[PDB]
Paper text:
Using both theoretical and experimental approaches we studied in detail TrmD-Tm1570—a fusion between TrmD and Tm1570 proteins found in 66 organisms. Within the PF01746 family, there is a well-studied TrmD protein that modifies the N1 position of G37 in tRNA. In the PF01746-PF09936 architecture, TrmD is fused with Tm1570. The Tm1570 protein belongs to the SAM-dependent RNA MT family (Pfam ID: PF09936).
Residue numbers in the entry:
A (entry chain A): -2 to 430
B (entry chain B): 0 to 241, 247 to 312, 328 to 429
Amino acid sequence: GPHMKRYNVITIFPEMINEIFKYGVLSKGIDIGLFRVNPINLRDYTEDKHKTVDDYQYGGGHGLVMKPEPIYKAIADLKSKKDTHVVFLDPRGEQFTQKTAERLYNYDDITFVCGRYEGIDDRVRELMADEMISIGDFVITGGELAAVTIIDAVARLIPGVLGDENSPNEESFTTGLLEYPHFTRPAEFMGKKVPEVLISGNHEEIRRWRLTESIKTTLQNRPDMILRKSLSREEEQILWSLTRGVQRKYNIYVALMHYPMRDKEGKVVTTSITNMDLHDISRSCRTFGVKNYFVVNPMPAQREIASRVVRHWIKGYGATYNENRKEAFEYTIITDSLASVIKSIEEKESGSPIIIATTARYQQKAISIEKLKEIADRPILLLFGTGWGFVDDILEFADYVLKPIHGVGDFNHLSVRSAVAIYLDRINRSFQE
Amino acid sequence: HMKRYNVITIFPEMINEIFKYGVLSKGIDIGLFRVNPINLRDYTEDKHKTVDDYQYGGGHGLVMKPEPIYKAIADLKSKKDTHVVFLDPRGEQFTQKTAERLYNYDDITFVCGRYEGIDDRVRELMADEMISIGDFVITGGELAAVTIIDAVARLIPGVLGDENSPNEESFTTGLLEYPHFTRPAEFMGKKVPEVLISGNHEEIRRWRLTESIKTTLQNRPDMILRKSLSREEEQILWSLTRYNIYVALMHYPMRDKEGKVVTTSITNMDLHDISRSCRTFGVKNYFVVNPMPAQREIASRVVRHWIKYTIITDSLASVIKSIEEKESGSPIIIATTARYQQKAISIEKLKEIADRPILLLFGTGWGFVDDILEFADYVLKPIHGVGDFNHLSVRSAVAIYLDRINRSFQ
Ligand SMILES: C[S@@+](CC[C@H](N)C(=O)[O-])C[C@H]1O[C@@H](n2cnc3c(N)ncnc32)[C@H](O)[C@@H]1O
Ligand SMILES: C[S@@+](CC[C@H](N)C(=O)[O-])C[C@H]1O[C@@H](n2cnc3c(N)ncnc32)[C@H](O)[C@@H]1O
Ligand SMILES: C[S@@+](CC[C@H](N)C(=O)[O-])C[C@H]1O[C@@H](n2cnc3c(N)ncnc32)[C@H](O)[C@@H]1O
Ligand SMILES: C[S@@+](CC[C@H](N)C(=O)[O-])C[C@H]1O[C@@H](n2cnc3c(N)ncnc32)[C@H](O)[C@@H]1O
Ligand SMILES: [Cl-]
Ligand SMILES: [Cl-]
Ligand SMILES: [Cl-]
Ligand SMILES: [Cl-]
Ligand SMILES: [Mg+2]
Ligand SMILES: [Mg+2]
């Protein structure tokens, strides 16, 4: 809103707060009137010779807890002068992050309540707190350092508090990423040279180098942040180049077969390749780290059609038209037979896959996906069918058959594309667990 | 052996002033530990005591120079073994586990940056590790250093007394702590829990453990999942923790590749494929939502032809009124997207808050514009697999989320 930002800090150590804000860029912001820090001496709101703000807690022992009355009066006094937003600093509160700093920025007046000893009588917290905030997943002796750290993080977002020396718009966490490294003179320090692109490169080379190192530092140190970052197309392509070739504990392959399938009467048939099975299943397989998606069809003309599609997205204009479809088709292989799939996997893994077929129908001795990680020290090949599904010969050749996907009731006639997506999600969630 | 914490900073007196207050200052006075601020400007050559300079690669951002920090750390190491921590957002997120690990050192040196940060060559040459105080940015490392020192020094035996014991605390236990109260017994009509006034020790212990588990479950459920619970703790949790679905496929307002708002055309297979997934998983109705009359006519012709439950309609508002008529109550509106949104929720969180019919919204094109995501009551966490690629078709996302919802009730 329209008022200068003001941060009131209720504390038994008000001069600790004053002293902290004499230093650094924030003290300059205070000096020229961009915000204000207002320490409130909690002992002022007492009426005994000891200026008592704490007492022995209920429940036994001699642990000390801050009393409700002084804190209540201190907050009531502020509210009597101005509207304020009341934050109790407490390990039980929201873990403070950059998103918290950006949210708290919108208030014009915030009051931070600092406890000491065991904590604060929870009645005045329930009565007066607008929220609780924790500075982190650890414990400190008092809220004072939590308060000034939050004030620092919030006040440095006030326009004009910072300037050229360090901008708040491109920074770790603010961007959803960890920042790239920084360097200054000299060009070489104890044999360690500043990256040459930063010395003699053009603007675009520098930007690309910085973006790459940021994504790399984030992937390596805080992969959890990658999952929460909405990556641009450029950032995604950098990420893929960094994860390419990383081996996981599990090597899963998917094959979509078109022979031998059943017709409506159970006779053996060869099916045509459905264009969307190429698109949809290649993207599911890539999402779940499948090592290769095999498209198996014994008819030369079907393979030629499918290979042309893949080439359009890998080497033709599709590669520019939709980069993530290219990325997914990079792992798709058009081939003629299950024997070819097995020999290809044997070449890639130096071991024969365990072959697992799929069906909507009941099969004796069918397994659940939990069995898969039991045996995932070897390559796993999941077989999916087309038409009316696999003939019985394939279900018997396979090493295992997965239990069918069911929901509620009898109807479970999913597209093969939906069945692939479900089984891969189940496998991924099982292995994480 | 007394613990020593050296802080390399351009503001040495800030460090000295901070440690005059509170229980930590008494611990310093009797020799339980010691904080030694190091003036980084003492390790400069010029008249201006220069510790920073403009960075390579453009602009006017200031970066801490490598040489002063190098000389400051080398000077310390020439006199005693020390463990060197660079304070940096890119480091290990500081937690109670971190504090307990750092406690084992007898001498730690904290390096505080200012402005854009520290020349990374001296970090590579001299850091033993990097530590971040949290997932946020502050103007300098000084407050991060003193906050870490506070957290570590208070685990030194004798620093704390009976005022507050460090053995049973939030995070140290893997849980959040129970509430605390002191005199008076009643404050503005609020009575202290009577068990704490007139209960026996076992009753007080049970109440505290239950409120702690209750608080942890409600505020930090992630902490519950990480904790190896006692048999008693797991029984308490159990006692604390002891649905019609609709699906709409929307074609406005969606992003195109450039992020502009568009209406998409119907994709024929979205009609058959998503129908079969909804029918498999007991969805009450599948709504196909498109504001263009010609697209609605196409969808109706595809459905009549495809067969030789699914409702073609014009707007989200029409879907909502339709469900309100069927269920005699408004649904909770849940949007889906591959992009993580703040406060997005899991399928497991959805099951716990679903006391009304649920409408799941699925997009087309390049997905929902942000305005839809903000209007929805909740947005689901994105589907992820290996974590570097999650561009699924809408048909596959429907299948996955419905299977997850089905399995959460099994
Ligand atoms: C030793 S703490 C008491 C913590 C409490 N016994 C617990 O375990 O949850 C004393 C005061 O320091 C502050 N404090 C300690 N850790 C904090 C954190 N992580 N976030 C915010 N404030 C904290 C609080 O204001 C608290 O009242
Ligand atoms: C259109 S379905 C044919 C359904 C046939 N009744 C069958 O054997 O599953 C084509 C392929 O999708 C997969 N599929 C479809 N529904 C499935 C389900 N409910 N459980 C497991 N796989 C399924 C199977 O791979 C099947 O070969
Ligand atoms: C404004 S920060 C520079 C941050 C850097 N530009 C970035 O975005 O990652 C200046 C100094 O404050 C300290 N600092 C800022 N945030 C920190 C954090 N989360 N953890 C530890 N130190 C931090 C660091 O010592 C840093 O060198
Ligand atoms: C083809 S996607 C649109 C583009 C998509 N937002 C992307 O970046 O990949 C069509 C719809 O499928 C759903 N969807 C696709 N991938 C998803 C994912 N990974 N997580 C959640 N929903 C997803 C969303 O409802 C989305 O609106
Ligand atoms: Cl004071
Ligand atoms: Cl074959
Ligand atoms: Cl100073
Ligand atoms: Cl989920
Ligand atoms: Mg920056
Ligand atoms: Mg405690």
